[PDB]
Symmetry: C3
Subunit: 167 residues, 3 copies
């Protein structure tokens, strides 16, 4: 009788503390023993959100569709980053060269080639690694590039209008 | 009495297994029925971490502030990636062109324009898609670009010092 | 006796609803009081997956090794994005300039330098910010860049073959 009272008090503490730990608006109802389902919002890649009613569904959505501000629309193999401090972003991206980035579907990394001259005094003649936007035969056109400084010191990229102008 | 014993044994198994499933250092106390709150670390965008005491808080922080090594500082609309295998990163980024990337706040994607000549024998004359660092009137200056190979085969970007040198 | 029945019914509802909220295939066994451990898949950076048997382990893996399609291979300090709407990706990346991107290990951002002429009529003469693939003395060679349009309007990046051709 005191034992019964002890149990119901304890199961209410169990219920409440499980509900607290879950968050997402979960609540415990001592009348039924039920924790109301949590609601966890995840961000789809198409400008919409999903409501998840379990932690596992939310975790799965995070991997399948990304997080807010970081979306890759794919079902293809995961990116692979094995280079030291390397970053691989998008389906089938591979960043195996150290201190490098592969970004874009199927992007790969190969070793940087130092270029000091070809015309001398090039800035950024000693690359730490590569920043790849694609792969051989699968190149990407880099777009919306502001005009870069044209100077001996400049490590800004140059755009097509600048090459147009010099010619 | 045996029924009571049965229940307390079972609620301890419920408590322990709920605590196990939660992780984050959650523990069950049979004396009170309470699961001690989990502690889940998330990574803020400002070089600090947050301690979350529910799964929902942690999930919400992951979306709001990013994950370790992947941070976008914003409260603006989510990125949208609807192109096949496309990647959209940052607030208001839109990657609707297939096999493309939009990266940076407000970046957009338009179709790649194949360029074989303008001067002939251009490498990377058949782009698979675009890698956008911005949008018309909202361009980004691409910086810290190492000198690229200057050769007929080269699909390296060129920097401003290289254009400076050739002129 | 009715009180006992009440409790076991309620603890089964507690068990089931905790198992539901957890997902990951967790199930409640009324015979033992045990919730079977959840299984949450996270994506490693090396082309493999991890099986996590707690929410906390899964959250920790998400931060340590990334999410599917978004991987940074590192144990170095977190990226920092403090610029308004800025994005910082990779270990030690810092995007403190507004509307900017730092991407790649140790990448930094400095203010964009508007360039209208150096040779006039440059497109993208008013950058909104920078897109940095590195830092001074730690530059990255940008690779697999498709040929950009060579025109007065062009904000496409140019590759080395294009500079080769014009020279």
């Amino acid at each position: 009788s005191t034992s019964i009272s002890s149990i119901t008090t304890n199961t209410t503490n169990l219920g409440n503390s499980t509900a607290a730990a879950l968050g997402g608006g979960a609540t415990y109802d001592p009348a039924t023993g039920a924790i109301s389902a949590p609601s966890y919002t995840t961000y789809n890649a198409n400008g919409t959100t999903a409501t998840n009613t379990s932690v596992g569904a939310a975790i799965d959505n995070i991997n399948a569709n990304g997080i807010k501000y970081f979306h890759a629309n794919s079902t293809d193999p995961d990116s692979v980053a094995t280079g030291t401090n390397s970053v691989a972003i998008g389906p089938n991206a591979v960043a195996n060269v150290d201190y490098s980035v592969a970004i874009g579907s199927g992007a790969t990394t190969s070793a940087a080639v130092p270029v000091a001259s070809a015309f001398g005094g090039f800035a950024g003649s000693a690359p730490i690694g590569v920043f790849s936007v694609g792969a051989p035969g699968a190149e990407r056109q880099i777009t919306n590039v502001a005009a870069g400084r044209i100077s001996a010191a400049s490590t800004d990229a140059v755009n097509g209008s600048q090459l147009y102008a010099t010619n």
